[PDB]
Amino acid sequence: MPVVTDKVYFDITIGDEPVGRVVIGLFGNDVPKTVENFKQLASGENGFGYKGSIFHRVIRNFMIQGGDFTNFDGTGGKSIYGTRFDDENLKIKHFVGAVSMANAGPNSNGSQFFVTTAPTPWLDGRHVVFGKVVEGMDVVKKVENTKTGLNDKPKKAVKINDCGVL
């Protein structure tokens, strides 16, 4: 298993009601550049980041996706290195509770990421896995079961009300 070297928290609300904290353990020895991006975006130290952003796409028994702090719809976000950065390591496979970079094809990591709640083996090799959930899988589950609309957008906003580096 990859070693966890750092942790980030997300305090999440649904429709402005608190539903709990997710703590993600990060694999900084295997993908240090990807882990630095996600830590800096959680801390907001470049003036922009995840606080206040939403999980815009939620699919029951598959994944929750968020990190689009520019457009809030899946079209946006940016890394601390520029709009996009390259795939750092594709060797780590997904597993239930994996945290992985969303992308638009090869070498197109930004700020968007997803947390799985079921196997997603068809994503192996194509998305950079960079951590896993170490607390609050039950909170991810609440989000996973929230009622959705067009293109799996949550009817009530699922918001990262606060976040940071532990």
Residue where the block lists tokens 């999440």: 12
Whether 103 sits among the annotated catalytic residues: the reply is yes
Is residue 102 classed as helix, strand or coil in its secondary structure?
coil
Between strands 63-66 and 98-101, the pairing is unpaired
Whether 57 sits among the annotated catalytic residues: the reply is yes
Whether 123 sits among the annotated catalytic residues: the reply is yes
Whether 95 sits among the annotated catalytic residues: the reply is no
Q: Can you read off the two tokens belonging to residue 54? A: 């939403």
Q: Out of 41, 57, 85, 109, which one is annotated catalytic?
A: 57
Architecture of domain 1-166: Beta Barrel (2.40)
CA distance 83 to 105: 14
Q: Out of 48, 62, 72, 95, which one is annotated catalytic?
A: 62
Whether 38 sits among the annotated catalytic residues: the reply is no
- If we measure between CA atoms, which residue out of 128, 164, 160 comes closest to residue 39? 164
Angle at CA 14, nearest 5°, toward 115 and 132? 20
Technique used by the depositors: X-ray
- If we measure between CA atoms, which residue out of 127, 126, 118 comes closest to residue 97? 118
Q: Can you read off the two tokens belonging to residue 72? A: 């809030």
Whether 21 sits among the annotated catalytic residues: the reply is no
Q: Out of 27, 69, 114, 130, which one is annotated catalytic?
A: 114
Q: Out of 37, 65, 109, 112, which one is annotated catalytic?
A: 65
Q: Out of 38, 41, 127, 130, which one is annotated catalytic?
A: 127
Sheet holding 63-66, edge to edge: 57-59, 63-66, 113-116, 98-101, 129-135, 17-26, 6-14, 158-165
